[model samples]
Target: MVLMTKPGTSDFVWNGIPLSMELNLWNIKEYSGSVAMKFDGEKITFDADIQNLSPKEPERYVLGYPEFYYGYKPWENHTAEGSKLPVPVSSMKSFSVEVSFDIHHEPSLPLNFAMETWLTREKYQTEASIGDVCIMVWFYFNNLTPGGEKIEEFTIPFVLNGESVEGTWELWLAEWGWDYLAFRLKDPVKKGRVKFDVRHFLDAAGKALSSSARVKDFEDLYFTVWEIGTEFGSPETKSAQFGWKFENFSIDLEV
Candidate 1:
């Protein structure tokens, strides 16, 4: 087991797959916060404490996104040269992800735990370059909403540790150069460990995009940068504190 108590970045080879972890305090200014991380070759345990120290609340303040990811990140030098896992959707025959995590946080902290990925027609060279599609799955949240208009609400099926389970999700859509789709749980998990397969959401996203004429087919999109972490910020308040631990994050793909 390896432990990290300071803010920085590190790399690990887990089960022969290269992964990168970062404690990105991107919007911190005059704030008191600390982060600690632990890796046991199979799972990541993270702790974060943050509080805004500014005299008055600014218009917006994002505490940070302390995350661990696999695959390609164009803006960062640490990611793999090209893409990893399932290749692109065009070449993928079957793909699924299983994620498990336990979390705790102060009530009404304006925080959320999410898994995200980018789908691009062509590889992007920089973070500023918009991709073709962005997909996000929110497992837990406290007084925070996704960025887009809620297009629909429906029940989705997923495999939970090999068992079948269903969940109701709100599908949100926003457009940039890329279409952003976020699936938010109707009832968020506050504490305790929850696990589920992510392929269901991807299929739902594909159907929605095709129906909206945003994409001809989801299978044509290239997948990049699978990331999971917490994003915390508040526009109404100036203080926030939260933390979470994740485990058994595995992605399976068949070409």
Candidate 2:
């Protein structure tokens, strides 16, 4: 089942479920489109049909592409009943968070179905301090469907160094290497599962950026927000008539 929607606000609260998640609708500003988000238990279907995606929508720099996100909000306390279980990206020893979605679009852009986490200097920081450090492990991107039909592979700037820090390099880059696709989950299914040791990812990315380890720095700072969602857009991200559906959206954390 799908519901109709137009551009609106960021934070979303549904009367159906007790869970409160944040939704950032960046598409409305970029294109004239209609999207549907139907929620049933843990599965959510996000479908969009757009016709007027302008070449100059992004206004000068490049195409902003219509992207959306919904998940844990760092601005608030994530509490259920009398318990609070917030996502700790740095302190966790061993854990796994998985996201599964069905693909029905071209690889021109990236659906950007990813498991992401963000950090800041303070819990209640000003706008200028927002988005201090962020990392994303794409569960899947572009089109990896085999034997169905293939599109031109997208390009990216850098390559994933399997030896970024040593072991578990697979957790950093996709099998596709340094291309834009490299930032994606190369194998949609076989590699969809996001299992990693937090310390490894932090140290690796920190080393790559020539900065202090993110996890180490944020060890005292709040490990605030993380999300799961689909991003739509690219210069050629089109849908004369496209339907996107995401199913079995669930997260399992073991601390």
Candidate 3:
């Protein structure tokens, strides 16, 4: 069953990236937004929709920043859980963001989550290349149905501007590669984290300059708009939940 949320309570506990092997794991570093504001001839901005969250709402939610510079739970005697974990970043200049979310109960309500980004500089400008920036929005679920039955029916309408396509490309090949799409599960009946993918949602994004004949490709991309709609209910209604992540978010050279 999904975790139920109450009004004004969005407490998110920061859990590190998923481990892969028997003992080895990938490292995730933290970052902070730049302050100098001068890089690659561009200007930037970033915002989220938490400004109006009231005290008495129906669903309580929270986003977490895992304790880096602090502790870890799995390795108590060995370490402070995340002693090896990188420090948290106030801003991420480059790299990827992998986000996951789950819906607890139905007769359920959808939540709104959008993260707007910008790179603003007077002289230095940013550009877009396949490798520069990438974002992956992942939605996870566990026994969303009223009983033991697993209901995986949902819809996501992706919207993008200019020329960025909703696709993926592995480092080796360019044709809609494996990096983008809904990763199928080898077994969903036994695993909640078994299935996932980005095939049906918007992937990368780009911005155009005013009065420009053909928008230069390498400039930093700005967010025009982004939002998700999820419907929650039992046999009568279904839950459409989702999560967001911005990766490689960067600035490029114009000249």
lDDT of each prediction vs. the true structure?
0.70, 0.40, 0.22
RMSD, one per candidate, in order: 3.3, 9.1, 18.3
What does candidate 1's lDDT look like per residue over 51-127, in tens digits?
A: 66342334434466678888765456447433364256766665566667777777877678887877766655455
Model 1, residue 21: C-alpha shift (Å): 1.3
| CA shift of 119, model 2, Å | 1.4
Tell me the RMSD of model 1 versus the true structure: 3.3
Give candidate 3's whole-model lDDT. Answer: 0.22
In lDDT terms, which candidate is top?
1
Displacement of the residue 254 alpha carbon in candidate 2, Å: 4.4
Q: Which candidate is the best by TM-score?
A: 1
Give candidate 3 regions above 4 Å deviation: 1-94, 105-108, 112-203, 207-255
Clashing pairs in 1: none
State how far residue 18 of model 3 sits from its true place (Å).
Answer: 17
In angstroms, the error of model 2 at 113 is 2.0
lDDT of 1: 0.70
Worst 10 residues of 3 by lDDT: 19-28
lDDT of 1 at 243: 72
Prediction 2 global C-alpha lDDT = 0.40
Candidate 3 lDDT at 186 equals: 20
**What lDDT tens digits, residue by residue, belong to model 2 across residues 28-133?**
3355666665555555555566666654444221222222233334434332222123444455454333344555654354455554554545554332132245
Q: Rank the candidates by lDDT, best first.
A: 1, 2, 3
What lDDT score goes with residue 45 in model 2? 56
